[PDB]
């Protein structure tokens, strides 16, 4: 099966132009399910950079029996945009909060940027103080548009 095209629809939160480029297909490209999954993940990652922490993406192939071609229908729902209430470090028993906090690129009170959160993780990992560093972007009970960013570390 060949790909005839990719049609994106839904709530793209103003990022249609970038998303269209992420779903660009080459002339004569064949349908491949794992390429579809990668594309969906690329879209979710992009939306995360802008504070859409829980986007939904669903793809649906439309098969053309006569031409043996597939048209890919991609539905995107960016969902809610979240800002950060607190950045929390859990597991730092020896390393003082201030040492971890100066490595942060995400600001408290600002829109979530999943890339900023990831940069903080990489910076903490680079220090060599921790065996493991994981991040959890958690919803805040009672506050619909807030997340906490929790860095879970093991010393």
PDB file of C-alpha atoms in Angstrom:
ATOM      1  CA  UNK A   1       0.000   0.000   0.000  1.00  0.00           C
ATOM      2  CA  UNK A   2       1.211   3.479  -0.966  1.00  0.00           C
ATOM      3  CA  UNK A   3       0.474   6.662   0.993  1.00  0.00           C
ATOM      4  CA  UNK A   4      -1.598   9.105  -1.059  1.00  0.00           C
ATOM      5  CA  UNK A   5      -1.522  11.757   1.655  1.00  0.00           C
ATOM      6  CA  UNK A   6      -2.007  12.794   5.265  1.00  0.00           C
ATOM      7  CA  UNK A   7      -4.914  14.937   6.418  1.00  0.00           C
ATOM      8  CA  UNK A   8      -4.688  16.505   9.864  1.00  0.00           C
ATOM      9  CA  UNK A   9      -7.720  17.814  11.729  1.00  0.00           C
ATOM     10  CA  UNK A  10      -8.871  18.694  15.234  1.00  0.00           C
ATOM     11  CA  UNK A  11      -7.757  21.219  17.828  1.00  0.00           C
ATOM     12  CA  UNK A  12      -4.167  22.030  16.894  1.00  0.00           C
ATOM     13  CA  UNK A  13      -3.859  25.003  19.253  1.00  0.00           C
ATOM     14  CA  UNK A  14      -2.353  27.251  16.579  1.00  0.00           C
ATOM     15  CA  UNK A  15       0.345  24.796  15.510  1.00  0.00           C
ATOM     16  CA  UNK A  16      -1.135  23.572  12.227  1.00  0.00           C
ATOM     17  CA  UNK A  17       1.848  24.833  10.192  1.00  0.00           C
ATOM     18  CA  UNK A  18       4.444  22.910  12.221  1.00  0.00           C
ATOM     19  CA  UNK A  19       2.240  19.809  12.474  1.00  0.00           C
ATOM     20  CA  UNK A  20       1.703  19.792   8.709  1.00  0.00           C
ATOM     21  CA  UNK A  21       5.473  19.711   8.234  1.00  0.00           C
ATOM     22  CA  UNK A  22       5.865  16.874  10.762  1.00  0.00           C
ATOM     23  CA  UNK A  23       3.458  14.773   8.695  1.00  0.00           C
ATOM     24  CA  UNK A  24       5.165  15.483   5.355  1.00  0.00           C
ATOM     25  CA  UNK A  25       5.389  12.409   3.132  1.00  0.00           C
ATOM     26  CA  UNK A  26       7.776  11.674   0.284  1.00  0.00           C
ATOM     27  CA  UNK A  27       6.733  10.965  -3.313  1.00  0.00           C
ATOM     28  CA  UNK A  28       5.946   7.255  -3.668  1.00  0.00           C
ATOM     29  CA  UNK A  29       6.181   6.572   0.063  1.00  0.00           C
ATOM     30  CA  UNK A  30       4.673   3.291   1.257  1.00  0.00           C
ATOM     31  CA  UNK A  31       2.270   2.973   4.173  1.00  0.00           C
ATOM     32  CA  UNK A  32       4.016   1.947   7.392  1.00  0.00           C
ATOM     33  CA  UNK A  33       2.378   1.661  10.805  1.00  0.00           C
ATOM     34  CA  UNK A  34       5.519   2.353  12.798  1.00  0.00           C
ATOM     35  CA  UNK A  35       6.082   5.581  10.839  1.00  0.00           C
ATOM     36  CA  UNK A  36       2.538   6.603  11.804  1.00  0.00           C
ATOM     37  CA  UNK A  37       3.272   5.967  15.496  1.00  0.00           C
ATOM     38  CA  UNK A  38       6.483   8.010  15.291  1.00  0.00           C
ATOM     39  CA  UNK A  39       4.574  10.873  13.659  1.00  0.00           C
ATOM     40  CA  UNK A  40       1.962  10.812  16.445  1.00  0.00           C
ATOM     41  CA  UNK A  41       4.724  10.891  19.032  1.00  0.00           C
ATOM     42  CA  UNK A  42       6.399  13.829  17.217  1.00  0.00           C
ATOM     43  CA  UNK A  43       3.131  15.796  17.365  1.00  0.00           C
ATOM     44  CA  UNK A  44       2.629  15.067  21.080  1.00  0.00           C
ATOM     45  CA  UNK A  45       6.212  16.089  21.832  1.00  0.00           C
ATOM     46  CA  UNK A  46       5.759  19.364  19.951  1.00  0.00           C
ATOM     47  CA  UNK A  47       2.542  20.216  21.782  1.00  0.00           C
ATOM     48  CA  UNK A  48       4.259  19.492  25.101  1.00  0.00           C
ATOM     49  CA  UNK A  49       6.786  22.252  24.341  1.00  0.00           C
ATOM     50  CA  UNK A  50       3.856  24.668  24.518  1.00  0.00           C
ATOM     51  CA  UNK A  51       2.224  23.414  27.707  1.00  0.00           C
ATOM     52  CA  UNK A  52      -0.220  20.869  26.294  1.00  0.00           C
ATOM     53  CA  UNK A  53       0.720  18.125  28.713  1.00  0.00           C
ATOM     54  CA  UNK A  54      -1.973  15.618  27.784  1.00  0.00           C
ATOM     55  CA  UNK A  55      -2.656  15.820  24.033  1.00  0.00           C
ATOM     56  CA  UNK A  56      -4.530  13.087  22.193  1.00  0.00           C
ATOM     57  CA  UNK A  57      -3.703  11.903  18.682  1.00  0.00           C
ATOM     58  CA  UNK A  58      -5.543   9.213  16.767  1.00  0.00           C
ATOM     59  CA  UNK A  59      -4.789   8.051  13.251  1.00  0.00           C
ATOM     60  CA  UNK A  60      -7.153   6.294  10.900  1.00  0.00           C
ATOM     61  CA  UNK A  61      -6.130   4.770   7.580  1.00  0.00           C
ATOM     62  CA  UNK A  62      -8.560   5.100   4.672  1.00  0.00           C
ATOM     63  CA  UNK A  63      -7.812   2.297   2.225  1.00  0.00           C
ATOM     64  CA  UNK A  64      -8.331   2.741  -1.516  1.00  0.00           C
ATOM     65  CA  UNK A  65      -9.049  -0.740  -2.863  1.00  0.00           C
ATOM     66  CA  UNK A  66      -8.738   0.162  -6.544  1.00  0.00           C
ATOM     67  CA  UNK A  67      -5.437   2.060  -6.339  1.00  0.00           C
ATOM     68  CA  UNK A  68      -3.893   0.145  -3.437  1.00  0.00           C
ATOM     69  CA  UNK A  69      -3.272   3.477  -1.703  1.00  0.00           C
ATOM     70  CA  UNK A  70      -3.873   4.649   1.859  1.00  0.00           C
ATOM     71  CA  UNK A  71      -4.901   8.123   2.969  1.00  0.00           C
ATOM     72  CA  UNK A  72      -3.982   8.794   6.577  1.00  0.00           C
ATOM     73  CA  UNK A  73      -6.496  10.757   8.651  1.00  0.00           C
ATOM     74  CA  UNK A  74      -4.891  12.199  11.776  1.00  0.00           C
ATOM     75  CA  UNK A  75      -7.093  13.658  14.502  1.00  0.00           C
ATOM     76  CA  UNK A  76      -5.355  15.879  17.048  1.00  0.00           C
ATOM     77  CA  UNK A  77      -6.774  17.246  20.288  1.00  0.00           C
ATOM     78  CA  UNK A  78      -4.168  19.383  22.014  1.00  0.00           C
ATOM     79  CA  UNK A  79      -6.336  19.470  25.137  1.00  0.00           C
ATOM     80  CA  UNK A  80      -5.820  21.909  27.995  1.00  0.00           C
ATOM     81  CA  UNK A  81      -2.796  24.172  28.375  1.00  0.00           C
ATOM     82  CA  UNK A  82      -1.126  23.872  31.792  1.00  0.00           C
ATOM     83  CA  UNK A  83       1.131  26.088  33.863  1.00  0.00           C
ATOM     84  CA  UNK A  84       3.470  25.043  36.654  1.00  0.00           C
ATOM     85  CA  UNK A  85       2.497  25.459  40.308  1.00  0.00           C
ATOM     86  CA  UNK A  86       5.594  23.977  41.952  1.00  0.00           C
ATOM     87  CA  UNK A  87       8.764  22.194  41.017  1.00  0.00           C
ATOM     88  CA  UNK A  88       9.386  19.501  43.621  1.00  0.00           C
ATOM     89  CA  UNK A  89      12.450  17.336  44.270  1.00  0.00           C
ATOM     90  CA  UNK A  90      11.784  14.030  45.993  1.00  0.00           C
ATOM     91  CA  UNK A  91      14.557  11.729  47.188  1.00  0.00           C
ATOM     92  CA  UNK A  92      17.327  14.294  47.653  1.00  0.00           C
ATOM     93  CA  UNK A  93      18.517  13.340  51.166  1.00  0.00           C
ATOM     94  CA  UNK A  94      22.081  14.666  50.978  1.00  0.00           C
ATOM     95  CA  UNK A  95      21.927  17.153  48.128  1.00  0.00           C
ATOM     96  CA  UNK A  96      20.256  20.344  49.273  1.00  0.00           C
ATOM     97  CA  UNK A  97      17.285  21.743  47.409  1.00  0.00           C
ATOM     98  CA  UNK A  98      19.247  24.834  46.257  1.00  0.00           C
ATOM     99  CA  UNK A  99      21.765  22.697  44.362  1.00  0.00           C
ATOM    100  CA  UNK A 100      19.003  21.028  42.360  1.00  0.00           C
ATOM    101  CA  UNK A 101      16.911  24.161  41.919  1.00  0.00           C
ATOM    102  CA  UNK A 102      19.703  26.124  40.223  1.00  0.00           C
ATOM    103  CA  UNK A 103      19.666  23.497  37.438  1.00  0.00           C
ATOM    104  CA  UNK A 104      16.044  24.238  36.500  1.00  0.00           C
ATOM    105  CA  UNK A 105      14.988  25.783  33.182  1.00  0.00           C
ATOM    106  CA  UNK A 106      11.239  25.612  33.859  1.00  0.00           C
ATOM    107  CA  UNK A 107       9.968  28.607  35.854  1.00  0.00           C
ATOM    108  CA  UNK A 108       7.255  28.229  38.475  1.00  0.00           C
ATOM    109  CA  UNK A 109       4.125  30.149  37.484  1.00  0.00           C
ATOM    110  CA  UNK A 110       4.892  29.955  33.755  1.00  0.00           C
ATOM    111  CA  UNK A 111       3.350  27.768  31.081  1.00  0.00           C
ATOM    112  CA  UNK A 112       4.682  24.235  31.147  1.00  0.00           C
ATOM    113  CA  UNK A 113       7.441  23.559  28.630  1.00  0.00           C
ATOM    114  CA  UNK A 114       8.145  19.849  28.496  1.00  0.00           C
ATOM    115  CA  UNK A 115      11.501  20.639  26.874  1.00  0.00           C
ATOM    116  CA  UNK A 116      12.412  22.844  29.858  1.00  0.00           C
ATOM    117  CA  UNK A 117      11.481  20.027  32.207  1.00  0.00           C
ATOM    118  CA  UNK A 118      13.619  17.596  30.160  1.00  0.00           C
ATOM    119  CA  UNK A 119      16.575  20.034  30.237  1.00  0.00           C
ATOM    120  CA  UNK A 120      16.367  20.130  34.016  1.00  0.00           C
ATOM    121  CA  UNK A 121      16.442  16.327  34.067  1.00  0.00           C
ATOM    122  CA  UNK A 122      19.495  16.185  31.801  1.00  0.00           C
ATOM    123  CA  UNK A 123      21.269  18.783  33.956  1.00  0.00           C
ATOM    124  CA  UNK A 124      20.562  16.855  37.159  1.00  0.00           C
ATOM    125  CA  UNK A 125      21.766  13.640  35.520  1.00  0.00           C
ATOM    126  CA  UNK A 126      24.981  15.303  34.362  1.00  0.00           C
ATOM    127  CA  UNK A 127      25.909  16.166  37.991  1.00  0.00           C
ATOM    128  CA  UNK A 128      26.503  12.523  38.902  1.00  0.00           C
ATOM    129  CA  UNK A 129      24.926  12.961  42.341  1.00  0.00           C
ATOM    130  CA  UNK A 130      21.998  10.646  41.584  1.00  0.00           C
ATOM    131  CA  UNK A 131      21.637   7.011  40.490  1.00  0.00           C
ATOM    132  CA  UNK A 132      18.314   7.859  38.866  1.00  0.00           C
ATOM    133  CA  UNK A 133      16.405  11.011  37.933  1.00  0.00           C
ATOM    134  CA  UNK A 134      12.825  10.704  36.703  1.00  0.00           C
ATOM    135  CA  UNK A 135      10.229  13.360  36.016  1.00  0.00           C
ATOM    136  CA  UNK A 136       6.512  13.249  36.668  1.00  0.00           C
ATOM    137  CA  UNK A 137       4.323  16.070  35.467  1.00  0.00           C
ATOM    138  CA  UNK A 138       1.311  15.699  37.801  1.00  0.00           C
ATOM    139  CA  UNK A 139      -2.127  17.314  37.810  1.00  0.00           C
ATOM    140  CA  UNK A 140      -2.878  19.417  40.903  1.00  0.00           C
ATOM    141  CA  UNK A 141      -5.969  18.421  42.922  1.00  0.00           C
ATOM    142  CA  UNK A 142      -8.458  21.320  42.910  1.00  0.00           C
ATOM    143  CA  UNK A 143      -6.609  23.334  40.250  1.00  0.00           C
ATOM    144  CA  UNK A 144      -7.628  22.329  36.650  1.00  0.00           C
ATOM    145  CA  UNK A 145      -4.925  24.234  34.754  1.00  0.00           C
ATOM    146  CA  UNK A 146      -1.958  23.588  37.053  1.00  0.00           C
ATOM    147  CA  UNK A 147       0.668  20.860  37.129  1.00  0.00           C
ATOM    148  CA  UNK A 148       3.465  20.174  39.565  1.00  0.00           C
ATOM    149  CA  UNK A 149       6.733  19.045  38.053  1.00  0.00           C
ATOM    150  CA  UNK A 150       8.221  16.371  40.284  1.00  0.00           C
ATOM    151  CA  UNK A 151      11.838  15.285  39.908  1.00  0.00           C
ATOM    152  CA  UNK A 152      12.215  11.939  41.638  1.00  0.00           C
ATOM    153  CA  UNK A 153      15.849  11.257  42.435  1.00  0.00           C
ATOM    154  CA  UNK A 154      17.687   8.396  44.114  1.00  0.00           C
ATOM    155  CA  UNK A 155      20.986   9.118  45.851  1.00  0.00           C
TER     156      UNK A 155
END
